């Protein structure tokens, strides 16, 4: 019994009932959100969440978001039970690319490697592989998909250096880096002005925070989504 | 999803002492379109500033080019304050000649 | 060559009326614009090469933009974005056609590289896909992108040949900056060029140096041309910046 | 020109 919203009333899924165990689940987890459409239902926990088509077909993933550092191999997960083809696509910044395909495998990116399993593998991750991965699955009567958002991350490298102080926060990704300047008691300093955003060929960003130096120690304390704790540098 | 602006402050031509030029603040990549952009002359807002209206990139981002005629002085400096929603603190991007 | 049309409705609570702003681009340059907040609720020319069109053109175009305002989110500070257009090579033949949507700048439903199917990048958007592919919106859009988008782009290219095919060569410099005693940065500039597409690649001793090279994305200038630079960090040492633009008979090689 | 049809 899962609470759900049907497209524009409110209903529930066991009221509509059809027995699952004819077509096996990859797992069962029972705050969650749910939406039924004309029938296919999307189940969305904060962790993993399947896509279920009425049961006759379902598509399963154990995580809808994945934060992976660059270079690391991504075992993006996707699975289904019940086939014509399995395609993995990438959508990011308005650009739709093919990543992999299977019929009767064709890895568009050279290293792509794929109760059935479709857990595609991305070795040697690059910034250009960030985005929304759609594990489209085709079937003689269904074409259900599954969304995996692969947030590629890159830790910065802060090089505090020089009456102007400059810390080159290079190689970070994604863009939202917050730079806090601490002076020493380590009191924060206002008035730091960023430079123009720069990029490397790999897609990682380089930026520099400039702060005027007055007499005394300083610390370019850089926090980022890829960091458990805010790293930095001091001179 | 909100995306941090990519802000560039530069000139139409390489800066020459006293030679007329235009200060471009190419603020791109930002989302949503609600954004406050000011061109700063020695820390204070320039009054006579023109700007191309909201432009729409393929990336689903918006970009704006605020320009103003200036003469690049050696003893005076320029910047570009940006106050997008993703910016918990308004970001002032320095104008280095390069 | 590419002509794009953008349509965005920035929603407003309290104000009641979403701000519908429409723009058209040819080769990244704006030529038409509509804005609900403008003084006159009519679309205007923003380029001198399209003011020549007759009054039937504008009134014909203005009525079509009004219809798109009502149906901007028909099947979909909430921002809803729309885009469509076509790409063309020097043959003046169809390369690639787009028709895309975004919900708060996240990809929502986009037309594939083949102008036949849609890529729903949001799980909320899959009913939109199920609706459109049942309505055959792809086929009706394939006729416009392959037929109509290119034809007027050809006419616009003829009308603005002094503008769109300007093919200005980059006014190129080489700038050297000493960041430290043991290393320095070599920056090669591409100024006042057109189109915006340019390649600046660094090589050491004749082999590529991508791993230690930074750059900046192409910058629109106030003139109407573009700017760009790419910089490498050298441990002092002679490196070469290769500049490749349409306006150059031969790619350039720069040295400090 | 704009797409025209709906």
From TrEMBL, chain C:
The record describes its membrane topology as: Single-pass membrane protein; Single-pass type I membrane protein
Q: Which PROSITE patterns match?
A: IG_LIKE, IG_MHC
Q: Which UniProt keywords apply?
A: Disulfide bond, Glycoprotein, Immunity, Membrane, MHC I, Phosphoprotein, Signal, Transmembrane, Transmembrane helix
Q: Which GO terms describe its cellular component?
A: early endosome membrane; ER to Golgi transport vesicle membrane; Golgi membrane; lumenal side of endoplasmic reticulum membrane; MHC class I protein complex; phagocytic vesicle membrane; recycling endosome membrane
What compartments host this protein? Cell membrane; Membrane
Gene3D superfamilies reported for this sequence: Immunoglobulins (2.60.40.10), MHC class I-like antigen recognition-like (3.30.500.10)
Q: Tell me the ranges covered by the Ig-like domain, including all copies.
A: 170-253
| SS bond list | 86-149, 188-241
SMART domains with a match to the protein in the record: IGc1 (SM00407)
Q: Which domain of life is it from?
A: Eukaryota
Give the record's GO biological process terms. antigen processing and presentation of peptide antigen via MHC class I
Family designation: Belongs to the MHC class I family.
Q: What is this protein called?
A: MHC class I antigen
Q: What is the lineage of its organism?
A: Eukaryota, Metazoa, Chordata, Craniata, Vertebrata
Encoded by which gene?
Answer: HLA-A
């Amino acid at each position: 019994v899962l609470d759900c919203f049907l497209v524009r009333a409110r209903a529930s899924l066991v009221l509509a009932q059809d027995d699952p165990p004819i077509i096996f689940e990859a797992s069962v987890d029972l705050e969650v959100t749910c939406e039924i459409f004309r029938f296919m239902a999307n189940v969305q926990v904060s962790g993993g969440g399947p896509s279920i088509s009425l049961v006759e077909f379902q598509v399963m993933t154990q995580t809808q978001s994945l934060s992976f550092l660059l270079g690391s191999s991504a075992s993006l997960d996707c699975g289904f039970s019940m086939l014509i083809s399995v395609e993995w696509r990438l959508q990011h910044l308005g650009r739709g690319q093919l990543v992999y395909s299977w019929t009767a495998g064709q890895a568009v990116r050279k290293g792509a490697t794929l109760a059935r399993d479709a857990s595609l593998t991305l070795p040697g991750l690059t910034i250009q592989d960030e985005g929304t991965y759609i594990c489209q699955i085709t079937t003689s009567l269904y074409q259900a998909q599954q969304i995996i958002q692969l947030n590629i991350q890159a830790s910065p490298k802060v090089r505090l250096s020089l009456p102007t102080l400059i810390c080159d926060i290079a190689g970070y990704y994604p863009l939202d880096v917050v730079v806090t300047w601490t002076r020493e008691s380590p009191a924060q300093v206002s008035g730091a002005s960023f430079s123009s955003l720069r990029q490397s060929v790999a897609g990682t960003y380089s930026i520099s925070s400039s702060l005027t130096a007055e007499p005394a120690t300083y610390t370019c304390q850089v926090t980022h989504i890829s960091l458990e704790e805010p790293l930095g540098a001091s001179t | 999803i909100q995306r941090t602006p990519k802000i560039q402050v530069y000139s139409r031509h390489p800066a020459e002492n006293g030679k007329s030029n235009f200060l471009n603040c190419y603020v791109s990549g930002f989302c949503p379109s609600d954004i406050e952009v000011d061109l700063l002359k020695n820390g204070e807002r320039i009054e006579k500033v023109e700007h191309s209206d909201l432009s729409f990139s393929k990336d689903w981002s918006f970009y704006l080019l605020y320009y103003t005629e200036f003469t690049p002085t050696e003893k005076d400096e320029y910047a570009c304050r940006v106050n997008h929603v993703t910016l918990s603190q308004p970001k002032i991007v320095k104008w280095d000649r390069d | 060559h590419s002509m794009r049309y953008f349509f965005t409705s920035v929603s407003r609570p309290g104000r009641g009326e979403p701000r519908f702003i429409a723009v058209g681009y040819v080769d990244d340059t704006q030529f038409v614009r509509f804005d609900s907040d403008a003084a006159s609720q009519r679309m205007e020319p923003r380029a001198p090469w399209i003011e020549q069109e007759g009054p039937e053109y504008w009134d014909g175009e203005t009525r079509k933009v009004k219809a798109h305002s009502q149906t901007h989110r028909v099947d979909l500070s909430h921002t809803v974005q729309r885009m469509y257009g076509c790409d063309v090579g020097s043959d003046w033949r169809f390369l690639r056609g787009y028709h895309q949507y975004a919900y708060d700048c996240k990809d929502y439903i986009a037309l594939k590289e083949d102008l036949r199917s849609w890529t729903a990048a949001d799980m909320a958007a899959q009913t939109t896909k199920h609706k459109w592919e049942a309505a055959h919106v792809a086929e009706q859009l394939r006729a416009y992108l392959e037929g109509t988008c290119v034809e007027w782009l050809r006419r616009y290219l003829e009308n603005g040949k002094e503008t769109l095919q300007r093919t200005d060569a980059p006014k190129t410099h080489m700038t050297h900056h000493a960041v430290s005693d043991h290393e320095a940065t070599l920056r090669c500039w591409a100024l006042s060029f057109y189109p915006a597409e340019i390649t600046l690649t660094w090589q050491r001793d004749g082999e590529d140096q991508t791993q230690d090279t930074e750059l900046v994305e192409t910058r629109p200038a106030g003139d109407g041309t573009f700017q760009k630079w790419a910089a490498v960090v050298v441990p002092s040492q002679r490196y070469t910046c290769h500049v490749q633009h349409e306006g150059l008979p031969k790619p350039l090689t720069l040295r400090w | 020109k704009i797409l025209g049809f709906v």
